[PDB]
């Protein structure tokens, strides 16, 4: 049973999601609500339209990092409906170290804003953060992808007409004061929310003044005197009601960029994916078995079905949305790459979003393959992926290794979203491949130096290498660092993709245009 | 003598630059040239037009990182003239671990391409790299700002008409094979340069074939059979001659975006900056003393000279180029920020590039200041910095701390270039400020717990904090991680800025447009 | 106004001017430049603007509240409205103190009653008509449906004096 293993991995994932979703420990959660605040996840839930789906981004950020003191990186990010509008929601988890920004907290905040920009989605910031994690301040503060970029993003998104709305529900200090101050419209809760560029300790240190947080930057002060805020709320629930009313004033949406059909169900249950895909990425299988199950009516029109057969390219629909599926089905050849590049051209001209299903060991190796120009054929595909103007989605269903990652729309090629299955692996090369290649070089060196090794010693050398790639390449390590937007149950692939395509449908497409194709 | 200290810091900087410029140790350098190759820095030098200036980016990347096994991150990046055209040049330093990509090597490669994109400069890649640093493969391979982004950049820049030209002078393997394969035009040196997606060890491991690098992907093979390359060169010198000829076919440049005047010299020697600026950022001085020395004719028209006097805003010229200088002259107030925002609006409408001279402790603190809306006044300035369509340059001449960094166009606000003086510091807050604030909180906690500390103990607690900020905040730590594009001799400020403005003058400007200004 | 402009919400100005606050501290706090920021916003807004004068319309307040020179799509007045550069008593106080340095004030107080009257205003097309206050809602609803089909310009402002 492949399926027993898949079901085990999904049960593990769901336990990690439930734990991370609680945020801080029970003491922290109790303190937070002791004075009348709603919990962060309750805040998100009350903001949403009843029945709205919520596409959560990076829920297991910082997993196994910082000694696990920041579950989910102490911040909740996702997309959901507020007064009928799809909005990106960013909520500081005050139960996790007072909503402190660890390096991954910043990265996760920035990732949410990137999604907002690319899909033209309004941004709602539910602010409750005690500041930066000072021991790692060098990884939080100074660089292009650090805390400052949050405000570059707010301002440039606001200039493009993407609403930036903030609700200050707790602490907001130092540079974090710019979240509400650089919002288009800001709510603050009375006798609870505070905003200041310089907090009480710094006021005391600098001037000797003793001042409370309330006196320094409370809701009444900013809503009546300073004008830093625009709405004064009675409590968290009132603040969220007010945000919903603000969202109801948002202007017209762009029209859908392609024609959406009525959804047709697949012929098979999605749980059958567990039976069809080997958890071990080294074990071969027919990727058609995945495609046939996730697409509407289990129908698809395969392009070049009999050519370059280790890559599967097919037109289909998911939840009424047209899609061009590019799915690995073995080692990549020149023909596979030529086929992928062509297929991508068609989707680009026809305004068909691309779905990349990655399970990619790499390219065929050897003199005849390099002599046949496999590097330049691969290059054409990468050019097409990079330059395509249609939205792209990527799901790693198996391996994601080496140059194949690039050719199949990895994170560096700006797919709108990238997810991973629980069995997936990602690394510069496959674990076994790495061990085997490094042993080949080390074995040759030892021979040349006159100290050739035994079978046991070669094996002892490979074991730590295999451990490195297993440790650095598993989905939890990947998702903790936001190389992906989340680990998904394989049976949710269809749902998630359908939801994402709905989100991607309202950002205007650029013109078609490619870099030079190396013929 | 402030100047004795400045001169000492510059002598230290120049020794570090000379050492890093040698690349690998003498053994490595000898091996490299033993079979007829030119050294990396010789390659760059022969590529340039005789007499051309070379603006080198990030020469001290990876300083004090990786146990200093990768000086300059094993890669040379900068801008210079090739056949009359300003080009970004990226050269792998094969004398430094065979041109291996450490994490900072990738970042430095990407930084060069960012500069190429923003200023519409052709890219010339002199390839000679043995691959990735495998123990840190997780920081080299998978994410949006990792190795894959190099090829996303090549392709998207090529689509915009920014020439991508490659010369393969040594090894080129795995994903690195895409450098030449995704170039518009590629040169390779016979019986020296090699290109393959899969190298000999992997060929052997996978298939058992024994094949030499030459047999697998040599210059003759790619230039006669595969078509991966377009020119076959006799040696390094010939390859560089060929690149120069390619560069001579580049199409028309965009016109200058503003009117350039005849340069007028300043009234004072630039070395006088050493006498005028205290090395210690805490020591007050008049920033007018800097402005008067770096600008043409020592002339400037100060905007709002008598208002918000802790920020200096003046119109001037540097090497005939118009500039709007925004220079800190104390702690920021509401009035300073309002003034900066206004000044930026004017430069934006008048197409005047902005020059930010950072020496910023922070904002004034206290109830009256927060009540006067200092957060929202700061916000307006950040909005203006972020949204400005004119090129921006930043030089940190003193402190760069906290929210003031953001308001004064730090790295997250995409100035075309950002440099640092040898005396500069950068951190989420000033070292002394941090120690003082953290001691204030810790002292209060100890008191409240009934274990108040002595003066000696408070001091013992501050010492490691001061050491943290001195260690993480000095220019060598900053420049090693590419938070800046280099540490400059203060006396070169005028030259460097004049050179950069010349580079920024030919990228088309966007329209004026701001995010919401929080009035 | 920046918010309405970006969200594409038409503006409706209901004028009842009572001047700006006057005094050393108010001028020192920059009331002139703050008023100016609003005028810039009104003048440059790309969304349709409508103006209804429901009370007074006097001096600089007229400009900040989208008077006739700010090209609202339509401008109406209620029958109780008054419009002039300043009040009648004010104007007479000013012209008298220059003359000195009551029978002189009489024709001037009369002038301002005369010229500030809503019928004097409509006669000259300073406004598009005097309306029943009870018809405000339907007139505005009608106007907004007319304005809904002219393409909007891009957002763009003059320099804001910070």
JSON list of N, CA, C and O in Angstrom, two decimals, chain A residues 107 137-138 141 143 148-149 158 178 204 215 226 230 367 376 406 412-414 428 444 472 477 516 518, chain B residues 107 137-138 141 143 148-149 158 204 215 226 230 367 376 406-407 412-414 428 444 472 477 516 518:
[
{"chain": "A", "resi": 107, "resn": "UNK", "atom": "N", "xyz": [9.73, 37.37, 6.07]},
{"chain": "A", "resi": 107, "resn": "UNK", "atom": "CA", "xyz": [9.62, 36.69, 4.77]},
{"chain": "A", "resi": 107, "resn": "UNK", "atom": "C", "xyz": [8.18, 36.30, 4.45]},
{"chain": "A", "resi": 107, "resn": "UNK", "atom": "O", "xyz": [7.74, 36.42, 3.31]},
{"chain": "A", "resi": 137, "resn": "UNK", "atom": "N", "xyz": [18.54, 40.46, 14.59]},
{"chain": "A", "resi": 137, "resn": "UNK", "atom": "CA", "xyz": [18.17, 41.74, 13.96]},
{"chain": "A", "resi": 137, "resn": "UNK", "atom": "C", "xyz": [18.82, 41.94, 12.58]},
{"chain": "A", "resi": 137, "resn": "UNK", "atom": "O", "xyz": [18.24, 42.58, 11.70]},
{"chain": "A", "resi": 138, "resn": "UNK", "atom": "N", "xyz": [20.01, 41.38, 12.40]},
{"chain": "A", "resi": 138, "resn": "UNK", "atom": "CA", "xyz": [20.71, 41.42, 11.11]},
{"chain": "A", "resi": 138, "resn": "UNK", "atom": "C", "xyz": [20.02, 40.64, 9.98]},
{"chain": "A", "resi": 138, "resn": "UNK", "atom": "O", "xyz": [20.33, 40.85, 8.80]},
{"chain": "A", "resi": 141, "resn": "UNK", "atom": "N", "xyz": [16.20, 43.31, 9.59]},
{"chain": "A", "resi": 141, "resn": "UNK", "atom": "CA", "xyz": [16.13, 44.77, 9.41]},
{"chain": "A", "resi": 141, "resn": "UNK", "atom": "C", "xyz": [16.65, 45.41, 8.10]},
{"chain": "A", "resi": 141, "resn": "UNK", "atom": "O", "xyz": [15.93, 46.18, 7.48]},
{"chain": "A", "resi": 143, "resn": "UNK", "atom": "N", "xyz": [18.25, 44.66, 4.79]},
{"chain": "A", "resi": 143, "resn": "UNK", "atom": "CA", "xyz": [18.44, 44.31, 3.38]},
{"chain": "A", "resi": 143, "resn": "UNK", "atom": "C", "xyz": [17.16, 44.49, 2.56]},
{"chain": "A", "resi": 143, "resn": "UNK", "atom": "O", "xyz": [16.11, 44.84, 3.11]},
{"chain": "A", "resi": 148, "resn": "UNK", "atom": "N", "xyz": [11.98, 46.61, 6.09]},
{"chain": "A", "resi": 148, "resn": "UNK", "atom": "CA", "xyz": [11.73, 47.83, 5.32]},
{"chain": "A", "resi": 148, "resn": "UNK", "atom": "C", "xyz": [10.91, 47.64, 4.05]},
{"chain": "A", "resi": 148, "resn": "UNK", "atom": "O", "xyz": [10.16, 48.54, 3.64]},
{"chain": "A", "resi": 149, "resn": "UNK", "atom": "N", "xyz": [11.02, 46.47, 3.44]},
{"chain": "A", "resi": 149, "resn": "UNK", "atom": "CA", "xyz": [10.32, 46.17, 2.19]},
{"chain": "A", "resi": 149, "resn": "UNK", "atom": "C", "xyz": [8.80, 46.08, 2.37]},
{"chain": "A", "resi": 149, "resn": "UNK", "atom": "O", "xyz": [8.06, 46.24, 1.41]},
{"chain": "A", "resi": 158, "resn": "UNK", "atom": "N", "xyz": [-0.33, 50.69, -2.97]},
{"chain": "A", "resi": 158, "resn": "UNK", "atom": "CA", "xyz": [-1.33, 51.76, -2.83]},
{"chain": "A", "resi": 158, "resn": "UNK", "atom": "C", "xyz": [-1.34, 52.66, -4.07]},
{"chain": "A", "resi": 158, "resn": "UNK", "atom": "O", "xyz": [-2.40, 53.06, -4.52]},
{"chain": "A", "resi": 178, "resn": "UNK", "atom": "N", "xyz": [4.64, 52.08, 11.03]},
{"chain": "A", "resi": 178, "resn": "UNK", "atom": "CA", "xyz": [4.36, 52.40, 9.63]},
{"chain": "A", "resi": 178, "resn": "UNK", "atom": "C", "xyz": [3.30, 51.51, 8.99]},
{"chain": "A", "resi": 178, "resn": "UNK", "atom": "O", "xyz": [2.73, 51.89, 7.98]},
{"chain": "A", "resi": 204, "resn": "UNK", "atom": "N", "xyz": [11.92, 56.78, 28.05]},
{"chain": "A", "resi": 204, "resn": "UNK", "atom": "CA", "xyz": [12.61, 56.87, 29.34]},
{"chain": "A", "resi": 204, "resn": "UNK", "atom": "C", "xyz": [14.13, 56.97, 29.16]},
{"chain": "A", "resi": 204, "resn": "UNK", "atom": "O", "xyz": [14.76, 57.87, 29.71]},
{"chain": "A", "resi": 215, "resn": "UNK", "atom": "N", "xyz": [-1.01, 56.36, 27.29]},
{"chain": "A", "resi": 215, "resn": "UNK", "atom": "CA", "xyz": [-0.72, 57.80, 27.25]},
{"chain": "A", "resi": 215, "resn": "UNK", "atom": "C", "xyz": [0.10, 58.17, 26.01]},
{"chain": "A", "resi": 215, "resn": "UNK", "atom": "O", "xyz": [-0.11, 59.22, 25.41]},
{"chain": "A", "resi": 226, "resn": "UNK", "atom": "N", "xyz": [-3.94, 62.98, 16.89]},
{"chain": "A", "resi": 226, "resn": "UNK", "atom": "CA", "xyz": [-2.86, 62.87, 15.90]},
{"chain": "A", "resi": 226, "resn": "UNK", "atom": "C", "xyz": [-3.36, 62.68, 14.47]},
{"chain": "A", "resi": 226, "resn": "UNK", "atom": "O", "xyz": [-2.79, 63.21, 13.53]},
{"chain": "A", "resi": 230, "resn": "UNK", "atom": "N", "xyz": [-8.02, 56.35, 11.67]},
{"chain": "A", "resi": 230, "resn": "UNK", "atom": "CA", "xyz": [-9.23, 56.90, 11.05]},
{"chain": "A", "resi": 230, "resn": "UNK", "atom": "C", "xyz": [-10.53, 56.37, 11.66]},
{"chain": "A", "resi": 230, "resn": "UNK", "atom": "O", "xyz": [-11.59, 56.95, 11.43]},
{"chain": "A", "resi": 367, "resn": "UNK", "atom": "N", "xyz": [27.51, 11.66, -23.80]},
{"chain": "A", "resi": 367, "resn": "UNK", "atom": "CA", "xyz": [28.07, 12.42, -24.93]},
{"chain": "A", "resi": 367, "resn": "UNK", "atom": "C", "xyz": [27.04, 12.69, -26.03]},
{"chain": "A", "resi": 367, "resn": "UNK", "atom": "O", "xyz": [26.90, 13.83, -26.49]},
{"chain": "A", "resi": 376, "resn": "UNK", "atom": "N", "xyz": [20.77, 23.36, -24.74]},
{"chain": "A", "resi": 376, "resn": "UNK", "atom": "CA", "xyz": [20.05, 24.44, -25.43]},
{"chain": "A", "resi": 376, "resn": "UNK", "atom": "C", "xyz": [18.56, 24.14, -25.58]},
{"chain": "A", "resi": 376, "resn": "UNK", "atom": "O", "xyz": [17.75, 25.07, -25.66]},
{"chain": "A", "resi": 406, "resn": "UNK", "atom": "N", "xyz": [14.18, 24.18, -12.58]},
{"chain": "A", "resi": 406, "resn": "UNK", "atom": "CA", "xyz": [14.13, 25.44, -13.32]},
{"chain": "A", "resi": 406, "resn": "UNK", "atom": "C", "xyz": [13.26, 25.30, -14.56]},
{"chain": "A", "resi": 406, "resn": "UNK", "atom": "O", "xyz": [12.36, 26.11, -14.79]},
{"chain": "A", "resi": 412, "resn": "UNK", "atom": "N", "xyz": [11.95, 30.22, -8.37]},
{"chain": "A", "resi": 412, "resn": "UNK", "atom": "CA", "xyz": [12.64, 31.35, -8.99]},
{"chain": "A", "resi": 412, "resn": "UNK", "atom": "C", "xyz": [11.97, 31.86, -10.27]},
{"chain": "A", "resi": 412, "resn": "UNK", "atom": "O", "xyz": [12.37, 32.89, -10.81]},
{"chain": "A", "resi": 413, "resn": "UNK", "atom": "N", "xyz": [10.94, 31.15, -10.73]},
{"chain": "A", "resi": 413, "resn": "UNK", "atom": "CA", "xyz": [10.24, 31.52, -11.97]},
{"chain": "A", "resi": 413, "resn": "UNK", "atom": "C", "xyz": [8.86, 32.13, -11.71]},
{"chain": "A", "resi": 413, "resn": "UNK", "atom": "O", "xyz": [8.04, 32.26, -12.62]},
{"chain": "A", "resi": 414, "resn": "UNK", "atom": "N", "xyz": [8.64, 32.51, -10.46]},
{"chain": "A", "resi": 414, "resn": "UNK", "atom": "CA", "xyz": [7.48, 33.30, -10.04]},
{"chain": "A", "resi": 414, "resn": "UNK", "atom": "C", "xyz": [6.14, 32.70, -10.47]},
{"chain": "A", "resi": 414, "resn": "UNK", "atom": "O", "xyz": [5.31, 33.38, -11.06]},
{"chain": "A", "resi": 428, "resn": "UNK", "atom": "N", "xyz": [19.43, 20.38, -4.72]},
{"chain": "A", "resi": 428, "resn": "UNK", "atom": "CA", "xyz": [20.23, 20.64, -5.92]},
{"chain": "A", "resi": 428, "resn": "UNK", "atom": "C", "xyz": [20.44, 19.37, -6.74]},
{"chain": "A", "resi": 428, "resn": "UNK", "atom": "O", "xyz": [20.61, 19.43, -7.96]},
{"chain": "A", "resi": 444, "resn": "UNK", "atom": "N", "xyz": [37.67, 7.73, -6.51]},
{"chain": "A", "resi": 444, "resn": "UNK", "atom": "CA", "xyz": [38.72, 7.92, -7.51]},
{"chain": "A", "resi": 444, "resn": "UNK", "atom": "C", "xyz": [39.95, 8.61, -6.92]},
{"chain": "A", "resi": 444, "resn": "UNK", "atom": "O", "xyz": [41.09, 8.25, -7.24]},
{"chain": "A", "resi": 472, "resn": "UNK", "atom": "N", "xyz": [17.58, 18.36, 4.56]},
{"chain": "A", "resi": 472, "resn": "UNK", "atom": "CA", "xyz": [17.41, 19.65, 3.88]},
{"chain": "A", "resi": 472, "resn": "UNK", "atom": "C", "xyz": [16.37, 19.63, 2.77]},
{"chain": "A", "resi": 472, "resn": "UNK", "atom": "O", "xyz": [15.95, 20.69, 2.30]},
{"chain": "A", "resi": 477, "resn": "UNK", "atom": "N", "xyz": [11.23, 21.10, 5.91]},
{"chain": "A", "resi": 477, "resn": "UNK", "atom": "CA", "xyz": [12.39, 21.98, 5.85]},
{"chain": "A", "resi": 477, "resn": "UNK", "atom": "C", "xyz": [12.16, 23.06, 4.79]},
{"chain": "A", "resi": 477, "resn": "UNK", "atom": "O", "xyz": [12.44, 24.24, 5.01]},
{"chain": "A", "resi": 516, "resn": "UNK", "atom": "N", "xyz": [15.57, 35.57, -26.40]},
{"chain": "A", "resi": 516, "resn": "UNK", "atom": "CA", "xyz": [16.07, 34.86, -27.58]},
{"chain": "A", "resi": 516, "resn": "UNK", "atom": "C", "xyz": [15.98, 33.35, -27.33]},
{"chain": "A", "resi": 516, "resn": "UNK", "atom": "O", "xyz": [16.42, 32.87, -26.29]},
{"chain": "A", "resi": 518, "resn": "UNK", "atom": "N", "xyz": [17.47, 29.95, -28.22]},
{"chain": "A", "resi": 518, "resn": "UNK", "atom": "CA", "xyz": [18.68, 29.37, -28.79]},
{"chain": "A", "resi": 518, "resn": "UNK", "atom": "C", "xyz": [18.30, 28.17, -29.64]},
{"chain": "A", "resi": 518, "resn": "UNK", "atom": "O", "xyz": [18.14, 27.06, -29.13]},
{"chain": "B", "resi": 107, "resn": "UNK", "atom": "N", "xyz": [23.94, 35.57, -4.67]},
{"chain": "B", "resi": 107, "resn": "UNK", "atom": "CA", "xyz": [23.40, 36.90, -4.35]},
{"chain": "B", "resi": 107, "resn": "UNK", "atom": "C", "xyz": [24.10, 38.02, -5.13]},
{"chain": "B", "resi": 107, "resn": "UNK", "atom": "O", "xyz": [23.47, 38.96, -5.59]},
{"chain": "B", "resi": 137, "resn": "UNK", "atom": "N", "xyz": [23.96, 23.80, -0.07]},
{"chain": "B", "resi": 137, "resn": "UNK", "atom": "CA", "xyz": [23.10, 23.74, -1.27]},
{"chain": "B", "resi": 137, "resn": "UNK", "atom": "C", "xyz": [21.69, 24.29, -1.02]},
{"chain": "B", "resi": 137, "resn": "UNK", "atom": "O", "xyz": [21.06, 24.83, -1.93]},
{"chain": "B", "resi": 138, "resn": "UNK", "atom": "N", "xyz": [21.20, 24.16, 0.21]},
{"chain": "B", "resi": 138, "resn": "UNK", "atom": "CA", "xyz": [19.89, 24.70, 0.60]},
{"chain": "B", "resi": 138, "resn": "UNK", "atom": "C", "xyz": [19.82, 26.24, 0.59]},
{"chain": "B", "resi": 138, "resn": "UNK", "atom": "O", "xyz": [18.72, 26.81, 0.60]},
{"chain": "B", "resi": 141, "resn": "UNK", "atom": "N", "xyz": [20.28, 26.87, -4.02]},
{"chain": "B", "resi": 141, "resn": "UNK", "atom": "CA", "xyz": [19.50, 26.25, -5.11]},
{"chain": "B", "resi": 141, "resn": "UNK", "atom": "C", "xyz": [18.00, 26.58, -5.26]},
{"chain": "B", "resi": 141, "resn": "UNK", "atom": "O", "xyz": [17.57, 26.94, -6.35]},
{"chain": "B", "resi": 143, "resn": "UNK", "atom": "N", "xyz": [15.16, 28.55, -3.79]},
{"chain": "B", "resi": 143, "resn": "UNK", "atom": "CA", "xyz": [14.22, 29.63, -3.49]},
{"chain": "B", "resi": 143, "resn": "UNK", "atom": "C", "xyz": [14.23, 30.72, -4.58]},
{"chain": "B", "resi": 143, "resn": "UNK", "atom": "O", "xyz": [14.99, 30.64, -5.54]},
{"chain": "B", "resi": 148, "resn": "UNK", "atom": "N", "xyz": [18.43, 29.54, -9.54]},
{"chain": "B", "resi": 148, "resn": "UNK", "atom": "CA", "xyz": [17.44, 29.55, -10.62]},
{"chain": "B", "resi": 148, "resn": "UNK", "atom": "C", "xyz": [17.06, 30.92, -11.15]},
{"chain": "B", "resi": 148, "resn": "UNK", "atom": "O", "xyz": [16.73, 31.07, -12.33]},
{"chain": "B", "resi": 149, "resn": "UNK", "atom": "N", "xyz": [17.11, 31.93, -10.27]},
{"chain": "B", "resi": 149, "resn": "UNK", "atom": "CA", "xyz": [16.73, 33.29, -10.64]},
{"chain": "B", "resi": 149, "resn": "UNK", "atom": "C", "xyz": [17.69, 33.92, -11.65]},
{"chain": "B", "resi": 149, "resn": "UNK", "atom": "O", "xyz": [17.32, 34.87, -12.35]},
{"chain": "B", "resi": 158, "resn": "UNK", "atom": "N", "xyz": [16.49, 39.49, -21.69]},
{"chain": "B", "resi": 158, "resn": "UNK", "atom": "CA", "xyz": [16.61, 39.28, -23.13]},
{"chain": "B", "resi": 158, "resn": "UNK", "atom": "C", "xyz": [15.31, 39.68, -23.85]},
{"chain": "B", "resi": 158, "resn": "UNK", "atom": "O", "xyz": [15.34, 40.28, -24.91]},
{"chain": "B", "resi": 204, "resn": "UNK", "atom": "N", "xyz": [29.31, 8.73, -15.42]},
{"chain": "B", "resi": 204, "resn": "UNK", "atom": "CA", "xyz": [29.82, 7.46, -14.92]},
{"chain": "B", "resi": 204, "resn": "UNK", "atom": "C", "xyz": [28.86, 6.82, -13.92]},
{"chain": "B", "resi": 204, "resn": "UNK", "atom": "O", "xyz": [28.49, 5.66, -14.06]},
{"chain": "B", "resi": 215, "resn": "UNK", "atom": "N", "xyz": [35.71, 15.58, -24.38]},
{"chain": "B", "resi": 215, "resn": "UNK", "atom": "CA", "xyz": [34.85, 14.70, -25.18]},
{"chain": "B", "resi": 215, "resn": "UNK", "atom": "C", "xyz": [33.36, 14.98, -24.93]},
{"chain": "B", "resi": 215, "resn": "UNK", "atom": "O", "xyz": [32.55, 14.94, -25.85]},
{"chain": "B", "resi": 226, "resn": "UNK", "atom": "N", "xyz": [26.71, 20.69, -31.70]},
{"chain": "B", "resi": 226, "resn": "UNK", "atom": "CA", "xyz": [25.50, 20.93, -30.91]},
{"chain": "B", "resi": 226, "resn": "UNK", "atom": "C", "xyz": [24.83, 22.27, -31.22]},
{"chain": "B", "resi": 226, "resn": "UNK", "atom": "O", "xyz": [23.61, 22.37, -31.24]},
{"chain": "B", "resi": 230, "resn": "UNK", "atom": "N", "xyz": [28.25, 29.82, -30.27]},
{"chain": "B", "resi": 230, "resn": "UNK", "atom": "CA", "xyz": [28.18, 30.53, -31.55]},
{"chain": "B", "resi": 230, "resn": "UNK", "atom": "C", "xyz": [29.54, 31.00, -32.07]},
{"chain": "B", "resi": 230, "resn": "UNK", "atom": "O", "xyz": [29.66, 31.35, -33.24]},
{"chain": "B", "resi": 367, "resn": "UNK", "atom": "N", "xyz": [5.52, 61.93, 24.24]},
{"chain": "B", "resi": 367, "resn": "UNK", "atom": "CA", "xyz": [4.07, 62.05, 24.03]},
{"chain": "B", "resi": 367, "resn": "UNK", "atom": "C", "xyz": [3.69, 63.15, 23.05]},
{"chain": "B", "resi": 367, "resn": "UNK", "atom": "O", "xyz": [2.90, 62.93, 22.13]},
{"chain": "B", "resi": 376, "resn": "UNK", "atom": "N", "xyz": [2.86, 59.47, 11.20]},
{"chain": "B", "resi": 376, "resn": "UNK", "atom": "CA", "xyz": [2.24, 59.71, 9.89]},
{"chain": "B", "resi": 376, "resn": "UNK", "atom": "C", "xyz": [3.04, 60.68, 9.02]},
{"chain": "B", "resi": 376, "resn": "UNK", "atom": "O", "xyz": [2.97, 60.62, 7.80]},
{"chain": "B", "resi": 406, "resn": "UNK", "atom": "N", "xyz": [14.56, 53.62, 6.64]},
{"chain": "B", "resi": 406, "resn": "UNK", "atom": "CA", "xyz": [13.47, 53.48, 5.68]},
{"chain": "B", "resi": 406, "resn": "UNK", "atom": "C", "xyz": [13.11, 54.84, 5.08]},
{"chain": "B", "resi": 406, "resn": "UNK", "atom": "O", "xyz": [13.02, 54.99, 3.86]},
{"chain": "B", "resi": 407, "resn": "UNK", "atom": "N", "xyz": [12.93, 55.82, 5.96]},
{"chain": "B", "resi": 407, "resn": "UNK", "atom": "CA", "xyz": [12.65, 57.19, 5.55]},
{"chain": "B", "resi": 407, "resn": "UNK", "atom": "C", "xyz": [13.74, 57.82, 4.68]},
{"chain": "B", "resi": 407, "resn": "UNK", "atom": "O", "xyz": [13.47, 58.75, 3.93]},
{"chain": "B", "resi": 412, "resn": "UNK", "atom": "N", "xyz": [15.87, 48.48, 1.07]},
{"chain": "B", "resi": 412, "resn": "UNK", "atom": "CA", "xyz": [14.54, 47.98, 0.73]},
{"chain": "B", "resi": 412, "resn": "UNK", "atom": "C", "xyz": [13.74, 48.92, -0.18]},
{"chain": "B", "resi": 412, "resn": "UNK", "atom": "O", "xyz": [12.66, 48.56, -0.64]},
{"chain": "B", "resi": 413, "resn": "UNK", "atom": "N", "xyz": [14.28, 50.11, -0.44]},
{"chain": "B", "resi": 413, "resn": "UNK", "atom": "CA", "xyz": [13.59, 51.11, -1.26]},
{"chain": "B", "resi": 413, "resn": "UNK", "atom": "C", "xyz": [14.21, 51.25, -2.66]},
{"chain": "B", "resi": 413, "resn": "UNK", "atom": "O", "xyz": [13.93, 52.20, -3.39]},
{"chain": "B", "resi": 414, "resn": "UNK", "atom": "N", "xyz": [15.03, 50.26, -3.01]},
{"chain": "B", "resi": 414, "resn": "UNK", "atom": "CA", "xyz": [15.56, 50.10, -4.36]},
{"chain": "B", "resi": 414, "resn": "UNK", "atom": "C", "xyz": [16.24, 51.35, -4.92]},
{"chain": "B", "resi": 414, "resn": "UNK", "atom": "O", "xyz": [15.93, 51.79, -6.03]},
{"chain": "B", "resi": 428, "resn": "UNK", "atom": "N", "xyz": [19.21, 47.69, 13.49]},
{"chain": "B", "resi": 428, "resn": "UNK", "atom": "CA", "xyz": [17.81, 48.01, 13.81]},
{"chain": "B", "resi": 428, "resn": "UNK", "atom": "C", "xyz": [17.71, 49.17, 14.80]},
{"chain": "B", "resi": 428, "resn": "UNK", "atom": "O", "xyz": [16.73, 49.91, 14.81]},
{"chain": "B", "resi": 444, "resn": "UNK", "atom": "N", "xyz": [14.38, 47.15, 35.22]},
{"chain": "B", "resi": 444, "resn": "UNK", "atom": "CA", "xyz": [13.03, 47.25, 35.78]},
{"chain": "B", "resi": 444, "resn": "UNK", "atom": "C", "xyz": [12.48, 45.88, 36.21]},
{"chain": "B", "resi": 444, "resn": "UNK", "atom": "O", "xyz": [11.83, 45.77, 37.25]},
{"chain": "B", "resi": 472, "resn": "UNK", "atom": "N", "xyz": [27.72, 43.15, 14.13]},
{"chain": "B", "resi": 472, "resn": "UNK", "atom": "CA", "xyz": [26.72, 43.00, 13.07]},
{"chain": "B", "resi": 472, "resn": "UNK", "atom": "C", "xyz": [26.48, 44.29, 12.28]},
{"chain": "B", "resi": 472, "resn": "UNK", "atom": "O", "xyz": [25.87, 44.25, 11.21]},
{"chain": "B", "resi": 477, "resn": "UNK", "atom": "N", "xyz": [30.71, 43.72, 7.77]},
{"chain": "B", "resi": 477, "resn": "UNK", "atom": "CA", "xyz": [29.65, 42.74, 7.98]},
{"chain": "B", "resi": 477, "resn": "UNK", "atom": "C", "xyz": [28.50, 43.02, 7.00]},
{"chain": "B", "resi": 477, "resn": "UNK", "atom": "O", "xyz": [27.96, 42.09, 6.38]},
{"chain": "B", "resi": 516, "resn": "UNK", "atom": "N", "xyz": [-1.37, 56.53, -1.15]},
{"chain": "B", "resi": 516, "resn": "UNK", "atom": "CA", "xyz": [-2.13, 57.49, -0.37]},
{"chain": "B", "resi": 516, "resn": "UNK", "atom": "C", "xyz": [-1.20, 58.17, 0.64]},
{"chain": "B", "resi": 516, "resn": "UNK", "atom": "O", "xyz": [-0.46, 57.50, 1.35]},
{"chain": "B", "resi": 518, "resn": "UNK", "atom": "N", "xyz": [-1.01, 59.92, 4.03]},
{"chain": "B", "resi": 518, "resn": "UNK", "atom": "CA", "xyz": [-1.77, 60.06, 5.26]},
{"chain": "B", "resi": 518, "resn": "UNK", "atom": "C", "xyz": [-1.61, 61.48, 5.78]},
{"chain": "B", "resi": 518, "resn": "UNK", "atom": "O", "xyz": [-0.64, 61.80, 6.47]}
]
